[PDB]
Swiss-Prot record:
Protein's name according to its UniProt entry: Maltose/maltodextrin-binding periplasmic protein
Keyword entries, A-Z: Periplasm, Signal, Sugar transport, Transport
Any one GO BP annotation for this protein: maltodextrin transmembrane transport
Subunit structure: The complex is composed of two ATP-binding proteins (MalK), two transmembrane proteins (MalG and MalF) and a solute-binding protein (MalE).
InterPro entries: Maltose/Cyclodextrin-bd (IPR006060), SBP (IPR006059), SBP_1_CS (IPR006061)
One GO MF term attached to the UniProt entry: carbohydrate transmembrane transporter activity
Similarity section: Belongs to the bacterial solute-binding protein 1 family.
UniProt key word Signal: yes
Function: Part of the ABC transporter complex MalEFGK involved in maltose/maltodextrin import. Binds maltose and higher maltodextrins.
Origin species: Escherichia coli O157:H7
Domain of life: Bacteria
Primary location: periplasm
Keyword Signal: yes
Length: 377
């Protein structure tokens, strides 16, 4: 409530570094800043903010913030020209919804292919090499690739490579013969097409040929890679800190091509929104503008867990030499900035089920995506 700041940010992010910025805030103002990382934060915040509660500040990829804003859960952001000029204009665009700044862009997240340089001094260029490459590491007691198959974020780069798309926009009904001609529908879902089917088909066959397991989650994949058990993983910059502390010599590189096409990751801008129910919106601004989005604040979070390419131009210029940030930004450039509209939540839920269903065998790829296509719209 008043005289304190409560902040929510995901557990895989640099929440201890952000607590340090929060302590720097307390030291200067006397205002306590608590940072918490609840599970299913993106689900819990709309539940608890809608009743007027949850945190003063919420951290998530920008794709979820259009829903929060459309439901009135987010305050409008009030940066001056001079403060806006300090961040990249495309980072501001991701947190613009119905023309209003509804969050603070923090950093740019894109998946990259992370590989173990002692098992794999030269990473593979294409997805179609991994099968022959997994069977070669199986003769050394290892495997080629593991990544989280339970979240569609991780499989979308392959799905999108040869044709899958999601250029979601809410658009009005175009049917002369409906009674109601004033409502909107979601256009731009592209998951029941040839390109998406081919992408997810390749993934199912890896599982069917025992190159991956359909139950592999974030934790299983992370442990296997950082224990030297699989030669490659797919993850974002936040995952780098745990590999640094592991004994794995790792590289971060471009995702592999599929049928000659670049993998297209969904790009996220980590965003800091101010709860529309909060009584400390001016303290939230203070903390965000003058403590977090400074070199020293972003530096505290980034060396806890890497943020990726930071939205603050002054600090990104220092990180830009990092070849891992080059890989991040190069993948991000082959992919697409996520839409932020409210139906985004339904799109992710649809695609998650299809991926889990196709991978486990409950549906064919063909059925899974046909269902995904209908649910997303
Ligand atoms: O898989 C669907 C999920 O993908 C994205 O979630 C990412 C998030 O962007 C990252 O910050 C990181 O924590 O990994 C998450 C995937 O586990 C979307 O942001 C999210 O809305 C969507 O549901």
């Amino acid at each position: 409530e008043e005289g304190k700041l409560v902040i929510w940010i995901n557990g895989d992010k640099g929440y201890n570094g952000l607590a340090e910025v929060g302590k720097k805030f307390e030291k200067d103002t006397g205002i306590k800043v608590t940072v918490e990382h609840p599970d299913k934060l993106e689900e819990k915040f709309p539940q608890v903010a809608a009743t007027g509660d949850g945190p003063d500040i919420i951290f998530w990829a920008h794709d979820r913030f259009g829903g929060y804003a459309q439901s009135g859960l987010l305050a409008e952001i009030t940066p001056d020209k001079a403060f806006q000029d300090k961040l990249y204009p495309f980072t501001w665009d991701a947190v613009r919804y119905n023309g209003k700044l509804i969050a603070y862009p923090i950093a740019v997240e894109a998946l990259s292919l992370i590989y173990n340089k002692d098992l794999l001094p030269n990473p593979p260029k294409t997805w179609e090499e991994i099968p022959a490459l997994d069977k070669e590491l199986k003769a050394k007691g290892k495997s080629a690739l593991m990544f989280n198959l339970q979240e569609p974020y991780f499989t979308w780069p392959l799905i999108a490579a040869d044709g899958g798309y999601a250029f979601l926009k809410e658009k009005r009904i175009t049917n002369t013969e409906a009674a109601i001609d004033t409502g909107k529908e979601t256009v731009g879902v592209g998951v029941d097409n040839a390109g998406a089917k081919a992408g997810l088909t390749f993934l199912v066959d890896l599982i069917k040929n025992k190159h991956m397991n359909a139950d592999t989650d974030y934790s299983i994949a992370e442990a296997a890679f950082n224990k030297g058990e699989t030669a490659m993983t797919i993850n974002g910059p936040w995952a780098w800190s745990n590999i640094d502390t592991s004994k794995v010599n790792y590289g971060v590189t471009v995702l592999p091509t599929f049928k000659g096409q670049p993998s297209k990751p969904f790009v996220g801008v980590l965003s800091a929104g101010i709860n529309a129910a909060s009584p400390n919106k001016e303290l939230a601004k203070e903390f965000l503008e003058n403590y977090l989005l400074t070199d020293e604040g972003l530096e505290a979070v980034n060396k806890d867990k890497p943020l990726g390419a930071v939205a603050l131009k002054s600090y990104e210029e220092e990180l830009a030499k990092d070849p891992r940030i080059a890989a991040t930004m190069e993948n991000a450039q082959k992919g697409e900035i996520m839409p932020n509209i409210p139906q985004m939540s339904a799109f992710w839920y649809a695609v998650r089920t299809a991926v889990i269903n196709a991978a486990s065998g409950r549906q064919t790829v063909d059925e899974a995506l046909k269902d995904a296509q209908t649910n997303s719209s």
